[PDB]
Amino acid sequence: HMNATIREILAKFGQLPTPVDTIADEADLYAAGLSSFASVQLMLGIEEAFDIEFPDNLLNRKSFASIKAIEDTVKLIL
Amino acid sequence: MNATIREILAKFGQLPTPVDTIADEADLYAAGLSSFASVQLMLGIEEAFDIEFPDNLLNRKSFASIKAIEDTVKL
Amino acid sequence: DPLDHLADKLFHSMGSDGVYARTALYESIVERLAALITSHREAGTEALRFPPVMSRAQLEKSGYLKSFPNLLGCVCGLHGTEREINAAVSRFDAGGDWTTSLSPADLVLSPAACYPVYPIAASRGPLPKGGLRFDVAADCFRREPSKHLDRLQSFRMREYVCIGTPDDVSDFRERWMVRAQAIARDLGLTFRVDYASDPFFGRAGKMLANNQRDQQLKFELLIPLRSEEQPTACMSFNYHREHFGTTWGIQDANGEPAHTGCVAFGMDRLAVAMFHTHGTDLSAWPAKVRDILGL
């Protein structure tokens, strides 16, 4: 479900040109079309739809490179 | 009318000596009336009455003394 | 408008009337005009350069609100907490209005170059015999949007200011009325000089303007740019009597409230006047003008 929640937020904030259902778990989101400003909105969405606070050590491009990276990062937090 | 001006001059004139000392003929500027005080004085003469000066009489001369002001109003 | 054709070579749009980017050609002449004015600076003059903002408290104290409140630009910012600021930003993203969260700073955009000089003078105690003379410059701001090239919202001002006895300032005044005309003549400009008035605001402003014109406290050098019947003031001499001396507690050498006066050069109006008069091809400018400017 956590996977699906993340995917909805990526639709909520990702600003991606191609729909989230047509994006694999392990896949380059930035190549897909995730911009800097968007990735930060997305990050804020992942903070809103759950109730967590990323450490600024994981506040980077790598944590949001892919849905799986996001899922794993979120899991590694709680 | 004169009593109506003495209160205004005391209110907005901001001169270093009371308005009961000025003698209606003495120059108000030598008395201590400044330019920005004088425009506040003009605005007060328009408010205590119901008149608006023509820009012809809207000047230094019309506010030189207390008798200068009184004469201007009636006109 | 007759000046409009100059825009192509002098300015680029910045998306706001009266606010333009300046080309290298334009700035080269602004700089030569500034150097020329500097070459005429009188002995014993102290040069200060001011930023485009000044203290709001100083400007309030100067009386600017009693004269030109409609022309003032105040600096405002988002002063809240992270959440408050974020909320304002969020409203912008949402298509609402973030600016409702603005609050005033302690700064305004400087309306004229001379204002900051008076409290600086006052801080040094009583004036020496002969008074003090300053050379000041600032980027100034006037809230009056216009499409005319001689009416800008942001423009450079250069002033020589005299602070002293009434005789000190009147001597300075006579000198600069002559020198300003000699400078305009050397620049090959056509002009007349007349007494005029500042654009004081409102009905009280009508009385102020009348008094200033009647007392001859403001001299302007007027150059026909768009027409001879509506010439443009490019230099002015302003006699303030004891207004700023009293405001700031400046004492002359005799212990009396100091008089002040200033000659002001509108650097962007002068540059535009030069291009209107002589064209945008510097190589064709009159030999004597090129020599005067050091071209």
Added chain:
Amino acid sequence: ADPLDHLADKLFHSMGSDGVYARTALYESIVERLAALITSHREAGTEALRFPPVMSRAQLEKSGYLKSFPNLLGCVCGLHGTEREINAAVSRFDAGGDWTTSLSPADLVLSPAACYPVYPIAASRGPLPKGGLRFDVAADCFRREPSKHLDRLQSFRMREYVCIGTPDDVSDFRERWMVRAQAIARDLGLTFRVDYASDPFFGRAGKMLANNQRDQQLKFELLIPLRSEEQPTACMSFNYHREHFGTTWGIQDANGEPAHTGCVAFGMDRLAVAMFHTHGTDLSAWPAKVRDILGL
């Protein structure tokens, strides 16, 4: 106490506001020589523009400044009401109240960096030529950060060279300038190091932007010890924006792709203060080589 504080006497006069100072003839003479030195290193084919201290609020909004540095922005507001409304505001001030409640926003802000207005100007010209475009820009800039430290001003002059083009055009431009600027700093007898850095993006959102910027090496600074050797002051910056402004303003390179942009920024007041801190306030006592470099 701040090592810089003692400089104030020869360089500045108070204007009644932290970070806003009148500049003496001594100080200005050095700012002017520094500007002339920077001009002497200008690359061929560089277009020079000078901007006023204000710019379009709409342009600045479009550029994304609000998302990134909302806390630093100075907006222009004025008394835009009727004569009656304005007169009342003034009367409230006369009566011990606040006239500023009658202010409303104008369509202008004070410019926070000299380069912002150049991007729409470049965009208005159509596709970029091969090799891109280079600009030499300057403006008096404003950032709302009041401080008593002489190296942290609210109103300050910025000089920039800006490159707009392909990623290769821009990255080579930034490398040329990083080397050239260090050579200039050495000629001026300054002590410095160059290090990666990041802009002061606002809020939690901004911590991520700052992290990415540092990680992607999008910003170098030339850092000079002024207040201390442990916290040196950035006096120049070397900035790569990737396609951020090119995309925002619809600038197309010669290959039809969204243009990249970058800039080299010189903090004129910081550099001038650095010179005085480094060599003192008596110019005839400056090293002969430094005097020669500046044409003194």
